Amino acid sequence: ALLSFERKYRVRGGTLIGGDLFDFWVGPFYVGFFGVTTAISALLGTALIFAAAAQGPTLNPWLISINPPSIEAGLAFAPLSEGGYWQVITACAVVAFSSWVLRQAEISRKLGMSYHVPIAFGVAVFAYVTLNVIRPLWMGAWGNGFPYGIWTHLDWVSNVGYAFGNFHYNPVHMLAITFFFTNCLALALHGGLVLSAVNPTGGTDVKTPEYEDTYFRDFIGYSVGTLGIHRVGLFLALNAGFWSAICIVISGTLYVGSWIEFWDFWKKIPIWS
Amino acid sequence: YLTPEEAQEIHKGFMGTFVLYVAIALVAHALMWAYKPWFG
Amino acid sequence: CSGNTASGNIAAEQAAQEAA
Amino acid sequence: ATYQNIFTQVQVTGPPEMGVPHLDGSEGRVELTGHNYWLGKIGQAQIGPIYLGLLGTISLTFGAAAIMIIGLNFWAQAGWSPQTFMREFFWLSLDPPGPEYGFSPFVPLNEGGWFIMAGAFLTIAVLTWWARTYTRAKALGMGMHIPWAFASAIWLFLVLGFIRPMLLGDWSEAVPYGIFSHLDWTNNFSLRYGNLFYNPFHALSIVFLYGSAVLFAMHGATILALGRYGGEREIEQITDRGTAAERGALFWRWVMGFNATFESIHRWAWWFAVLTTLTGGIGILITGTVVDNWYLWAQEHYYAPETFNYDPSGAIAGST
Amino acid sequence: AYIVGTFDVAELAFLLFFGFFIALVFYLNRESRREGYPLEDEQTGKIHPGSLFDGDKKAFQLPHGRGTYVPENVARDDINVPGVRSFRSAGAPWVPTGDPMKDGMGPAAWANRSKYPDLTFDGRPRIVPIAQSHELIIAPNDPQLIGWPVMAADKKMVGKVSDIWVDQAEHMIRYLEVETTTGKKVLAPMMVASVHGNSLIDALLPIVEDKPKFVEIDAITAAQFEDVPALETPGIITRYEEDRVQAYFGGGYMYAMPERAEPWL
Amino acid sequence: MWRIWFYFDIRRALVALHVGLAVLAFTIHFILLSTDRYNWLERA
Amino acid sequence: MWRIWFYFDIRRALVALHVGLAVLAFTIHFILLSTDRYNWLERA
Amino acid sequence: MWRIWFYFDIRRALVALHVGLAVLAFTIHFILLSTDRYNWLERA
Amino acid sequence: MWRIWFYFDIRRALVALHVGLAVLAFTIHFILLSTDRYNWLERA
Amino acid sequence: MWRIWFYFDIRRALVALHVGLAVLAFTIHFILLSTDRYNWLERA
Amino acid sequence: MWRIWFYFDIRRALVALHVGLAVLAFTIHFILLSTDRYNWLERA
Amino acid sequence: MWRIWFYFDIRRALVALHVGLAVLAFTIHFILLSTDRYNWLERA
Amino acid sequence: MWRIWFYFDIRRALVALHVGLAVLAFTIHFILLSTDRYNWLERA
Amino acid sequence: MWRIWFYFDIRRALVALHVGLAVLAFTIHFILLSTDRYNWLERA
Amino acid sequence: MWRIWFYFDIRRALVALHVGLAVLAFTIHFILLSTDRYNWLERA
Amino acid sequence: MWRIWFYFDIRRALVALHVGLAVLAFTIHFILLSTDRYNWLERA
């Protein structure tokens, strides 16, 4: 009951698992059963990250890298110093993200809201699971996963991308990039329009939604509306995440080779060649 | 449609057109088989 | 995770595949 | 059974709304209006009307000129063959002048003159479009947030096309006009300057692009989940706090321990979106002009990994 | 490339942006503190002092001559809520003492909104029955919804649809008027109403289907429809009344039946 | 057998059937064009 | 057979048929042009 | 033959017909200019 | 025949005609300038 | 004829005309600067 | 002691405890499978 | 003791138990397949 | 000393304490397993 | 047993069944085309 | 003549004219600076 | 001095202090484990 209106909303119920067992708050944070699971998994994952780092060549936070086992090890559980730490941290991260989704669902139920936020975050959880669980399983080795390091997973991204020639020629990658760019443009437009509506110039009063409609019809000839903009932004962000997961999952499992050669299909269409 | 009579007339037309379509496709497939069989 | 050990997988890749 | 606020079940149709009157001297809206039923499923079905002042006319004419120049150069590159045009469209490109010309404004038309002309007309069109968004905001008494957000993207665009080539004195550093060609330019730019991953401003721009995707996902999901309480009517919630604003704040306060307001969330979104292109333009401008090898620069600042930190040979081998 | 020692231009730019971003985060937190602050104690309700980095209060110039808003001056909620803590701790939930839907607790809670209706830019009431709108009609290929049966959360037929309320600014249906068996007319949010018999896939499907065309409201039961908050003036709904109706329907997803508040187990 | 039309609308069924038939026919013709054996245009 | 015009609108069927037939003819002519055997313009 | 007008919009029909005619004519001219046999600009 | 102006608004028709003619003239001049035989600015 | 001004506002017509003239003049001056024959700034 | 049931409900505690026991048992079994000494499946 | 069914819904308990049993059985079968000793499909 | 229970409720305190104890115990056991000296499973 | 039609609408059931049969048949035909033993178009 | 001020606002026309003049002057000065012949800053 | 409790709530102060102490102690122990001089698990 910190916020001036918070107290009346802090009621029992809305939990999926646990009921009244963990139905309480700790400061601003609601816990629930999935909050307990999130706390355990996330704290264990962080502690194991730092335990594996202490066994590594450096404690520099830039250069800390918890690496997966070698490809020759296949899909077996490796020794902790030889990639097992990475596997345990991956399991902890999966559990933590799933528990975060379920805690968001419980909090949505407590406030009389639908499950839009848990589903939206579950899209990103699916992207991560595709990156570090599904793709290594399909490829046959845990060594295909990206390392747990701030700058070494960028090295993983670079090397995996260049293993296919130029990763820019992946068409699902093109679609995901288009969704990302359109999302950022849409977010700029939506934030700017709302702020300009509530922060007028020239000493005028706060505007109505008719003013936003008029502004975007004078600008580009069309206005999507107040509900439509949030629908479109959610669609764009979720599509960006989902198509990122799809684009990475098919490279190395379904498509092997240079993505540049794929576009030789276009030149062979009998309509123009 | 709604009554059995309209449904029967629609079925008559559909069956006639389907039979004509199948006959044309059969002639085409027979000509192709005579030209280049796909079962050696 | 599979039912094998990492050492067994590495030995199989080296000897049974990369050595013969 | 439960409505999920994804598609509008029943649409309301009526006479087209021509907009609130302008507070300045405007010529008058071109009353070309339409109605799209399928757009009304997601948002508003009304198309139009449109405003075409001096700025809109200039922008449309100069952008048409630039696009015509690029397309006619594509047609010439295809040998005027429509089939070759279709076959090689992704590979057609209007390329910048070669390094032997420096940053000279006088290049033969087929060697880069058309490229310079198209860049000039495109820049004129983009700048007049920015001026048009500024004047459209001014005509309604609204704020200038959208003009500044557009100015950030224009800053990145101008750094890519004119400012950086001007500072280096090399037209050949500019981005070619082509689908696959500008991707090739992106890849080559990363390759010649070490590795653009280690540009700290490229990393910052990635941070803000990722965060904008995150922010739009969270904000759209929250607003749609708050449709039961009029969450999408954000202007009225900002100027008169309802239960939708309270629930939206409390959800994120209970999730992560802190929250924004219905107005503050849009400031967060605006700043993330703007900072993406701001940091991107800053990082591109200093590449080559200030730093020529970003991996060396990262090595000097103790954040460049080696093989003893992580060896990517296995990941490469898996992907072959 | 170095400015002095190992300091260079790129490093200077990065440090400048890092400082600017810290300042921007502080500014964004200041903006986020404008609603609901200062904080208060969970039990005693004692108000916390306030941030050292706060500035001035924000004043909104309202349209239609409604004055100024000043969100920092919004009256704090009453400390005495109609509930009792499950256990005596600062983090325990409140169990409502009576009817949460009537008293406004948890998902059924409402805010003290303005007691006048929202207006269009020219001053007309924004949310009005579709007859009072300015030539606004339902899409001809869309469900008419007038006279359709209404299903409640307990699968009972509470009544029928007698009127449609639309937003004159956004051109959207906001409320459906439902006449119940007892004859009382109540407003139900369109966001809690599922329209059946109008599926896009079913229209695409080449079938002749006599699906029942009705409106399902699974938020509240048929009896609860008799306790929907009423309007002070016919044809007009205020912001406070809108919040009341929306809170009453939204709280039903937890409070319509006891099982809705219980874990799956 | 005629009673099928009491369940499926004839207009929509015909439209969907013809769209599917067009897609299938174009797919088969393009597949045949791809093959060296059944290509009827490149060689005499 | 003539009863077809009781289930399909002629004013839309004609437009759709003509557009599709034009696209088909364009595609076939382009395919023929793409082959050396049937190209009627490149050589005398 | 004249019975195609009391139900077909002469405006839309003319607009679509002229758009198609322009597209076809430009396509055909561009094909002839791409051929060495029929190009009328590069050589005397 | 003048009756064409009963079906077509001449403001829109004139705007579209002048835009299309400008595009066509620019295209033709560009094509001519692209050829060595008809380029009139490169050499004396 | 002066009657042209009964259908087109003189302000809009003048604005569009001068915008088009600006684009044309800039294009021509740029093309002239692109050629060594007509470039008046590179050499004496 | 039994008084622990005055602050925690048996129905929810049993579910939470069994979930934790399941995860712990799976972790221990997988750890045993990763060692050559205790792996019971790879070799005889 | 049937007391359990007074506090746990039989339907939910059965669904959860069968989901867990399915996941466990699939995991064990996949683990057995992964090993050469117990794989029953690759070799005779 | 007992007055600590005047400021912290037993339920949340016990939950947090056991979460922390679980995290710490798992961390220490994993760290011991990662070292050759204290690995009790790999060798006899 | 006809009683199943009490619990299922045969219109949507038939639509879903036909969609599934189409997907299965196309998958099987494509898989057969993939194999060199059962490919029937590449060679005689 | 002076009647041009019946159709164009003096404020808007003046602002637009001065912005255009600024852009043109900057463009011409930049072009002159870019030439060796007219550069006035790099050599004496 | 005891008067510090008139400005700071003991519950919030103790929880903040212990979270900080935990993080600092874990940081120090992890730093010591990294160095071979102070590592107490790798060697005898």
Ligand code: BCL
């Ligand atoms: C080596 C191949 C031969 C050749 C072999 C054949 C064969 C075989 C056939 C044709 C037929 C046609 N040929 Mg030929 N043809 C050749 C070269 C040409 C050339 C050229 C550039 O040299 C042209 C312009 C044509 C033109 C034509 C058309 C008149 C006709 C197909 C149009 C049609 O009726 O269906 C389109 C159907 C419609 C209903 C048209 C729709 C009406 C539209 C909507 C209104 C007009 C608007 C606009 C013009 C539409 C055009 C736009 C584009 C097509 C998309 N041929 C070469 C020399 N040609 C066909 C024919 O005789 O048709 C009766 C035919 O069977």
Ligand code: BCL
């Ligand atoms: C091999 C490839 C390189 C790489 C090379 C580059 C280069 C080079 C650049 C980036 C840039 C970026 N990179 Mg990178 N990048 C790499 C890998 C990544 C990865 C990853 C692997 O996950 C990610 C997330 C990114 C992400 C990003 C973005 C954050 C950033 C551009 C975003 C943007 O604002 O949109 C793009 C938005 C614009 C371009 C603004 C456009 C606005 C204008 C006004 C629009 C005009 C449109 C016009 C009117 C339309 C008509 C035109 C006519 C038809 C012609 N890169 C690797 C290391 N990357 C850019 C940057 O700024 O970073 C420092 C950049 O220049």
Ligand code: BCL
């Ligand atoms: C070479 C180093 C020496 C060593 C030298 C020293 C020296 C010197 C000192 C200690 C001290 C401590 N050492 Mg020692 N210590 C060593 C190895 C160990 C090992 C082991 C490897 O198993 C353990 C478990 C410990 C344990 C401890 C603690 C009992 C004690 C810190 C008290 C404290 O307040 O914790 C902090 C934790 C809390 C306040 C929270 C309570 C913890 C509960 C269980 C919750 C855990 C939280 C969870 C894991 C994660 C949450 C993190 C945040 C809250 C978000 N040492 C090695 C052998 N050790 C210090 C001491 O005696 O202080 C009194 C001290 O000065």
Ligand SMILES: CC[C@H]1c2cc3[nH]c4c(c3C)C(=O)[C@H](C(=O)OC)c4c3nc(cc4[nH]c(cc(n2)[C@@H]1C)c(C(C)=O)c4C)[C@@H](C)[C@@H]3CCC(=O)OC/C=C(/C)CCC[C@H](C)CCC[C@H](C)CCCC(C)C
């Ligand atoms: C539409 C897809 C996009 C998306 C959606 C989005 N993100 C979201 C949400 C949504 C809708 C949330 O509701 C959720 C949230 O609650 O934010 C406040 C969240 C979130 N997005 C987050 C991060 C994030 N999202 C990302 C991406 C995206 N988010 C997308 C592009 C990225 C990228 C691109 O990498 C980042 C880093 C967090 C701020 C939050 C998720 C909070 C969470 O998961 O809680 C668990 C608690 C923890 C303490 C974390 C677990 C700790 C681990 C066990 C240890 C670390 C393991 C890790 C694998 C180490 C590797 C790191 C290295 C790569 C450096």
Ligand SMILES: COC1=C(OC)C(=O)C(C/C=C(\C)CC/C=C(\C)CC/C=C(/C)CC/C=C(/C)CC/C=C(/C)CC/C=C(\C)CC/C=C(\C)CCC=C(C)C)=C(C)C1=O
């Ligand atoms: C309009 O409505 C909206 C708002 O306000 C009304 C919003 O605020 C928002 C939210 C948005 C913002 C406030 C803007 C800022 C957000 C950004 C940049 C994106 C998120 C990124 C971040 C880095 C923020 C921080 C993210 C986190 C995950 C931090 C989480 C931290 C912690 C400590 C979580 C702890 C909680 C748990 C583990 C669960 C509970 C368990 C416990 C308490 C453990 C108990 C046991 C012990 C031992 C203590 C949205 C989206 C919105 O739409």
Ligand SMILES: COC(C)(C)C/C=C/C(C)=C/C=C/C(C=O)=C/C=C/C(C)=C/C=C/C=C(C)/C=C/C=C(C)/C=C/C1=C(C)C[C@@H](O)CC1(C)C
């Ligand atoms: C890769 O494979 C390739 C190479 C592509 C080969 C594959 C190709 C394939 C699979 C193609 C398949 C094609 C196909 C498969 O059915 C085509 C069918 C075409 C048909 C049915 C054409 C029909 C045309 C009918 C027409 C034009 C009728 C017009 C009638 C009109 C306009 C009548 C008007 C009227 C008249 C006169 C009198 C007035 O008073 C009133 C009114 C009554 C209005």
Ligand SMILES: COC(C)(C)C/C=C/C(C)=C/C=C/C(C=O)=C/C=C/C(C)=C/C=C/C=C(C)/C=C/C=C(C)/C=C/C1=C(C)C[C@@H](O)CC1(C)C
């Ligand atoms: C490929 O490209 C290259 C290489 C360039 C080759 C091709 C080039 C091509 C195709 C170019 C084509 C060009 C073209 C093709 O028509 C040009 C036409 C130009 C024309 C028609 C120009 C006309 C100008 C008229 C002007 C300036 C009139 C101004 C009048 C004014 C300002 C009057 C104001 C007034 C006054 C005083 C008094 C008031 O009481 C009334 C009022 C009225 C207000």
Ligand SMILES: COC(C)(C)C/C=C/C(C)=C/C=C/C(C=O)=C/C=C/C(C)=C/C=C/C=C(C)/C=C/C=C(C)/C=C/C1=C(C)C[C@@H](O)CC1(C)C
């Ligand atoms: C992998 O892929 C490769 C390598 C290709 C291998 C695999 C290939 C596979 C799996 C292919 C499968 C194909 C398939 C699987 O069913 C096809 C079925 C086709 C069917 C049922 C076609 C039916 C056609 C019927 C037609 C055309 C009927 C038309 C009727 C009409 C138009 C009637 C009108 C009417 C009239 C006159 C009078 C009025 O008074 C009443 C009224 C009624 C209005």
Ligand SMILES: COC(C)(C)C/C=C/C(C)=C/C=C/C(C=O)=C/C=C/C(C)=C/C=C/C=C(C)/C=C/C=C(C)/C=C/C1=C(C)C[C@@H](O)CC1(C)C
């Ligand atoms: C580049 O960076 C490097 C390399 C580091 C070089 C540069 C370093 C630089 C620039 C550093 C600059 C540092 C700096 C520049 O000012 C520091 C200033 C520090 C100061 C002012 C510290 C002051 C501390 C005061 C303290 C701890 C007071 C505590 C008082 C307490 C807790 C009192 C409590 C109370 C009590 C008992 C009784 C109650 O009745 C009343 C109440 C009051 C509640």
Ligand SMILES: COC(C)(C)CCC/C(C)=C/C=C/C(C)=C/C=C/C(C)=C/C=C\C=C(C)\C=C\C=C(C)\C=C\C=C(/C)CCCC(C)(C)OC
């Ligand atoms: C159908 O056929 C027709 C011909 C009718 C239409 C054809 C249409 C087609 C097919 C068009 C296709 C266009 C495509 C595919 C374009 C793709 C472009 C892409 C991908 C571009 C990407 C990036 C481009 C950038 C960043 C460009 C920036 C350029 C700038 C900023 C240039 C500035 C130049 C200036 C300021 C001019 C200076 C002039 C000077 C120096 C002389 O004086 C100051």
Ligand SMILES: [Fe+3]
């Ligand atoms: Fe919003």
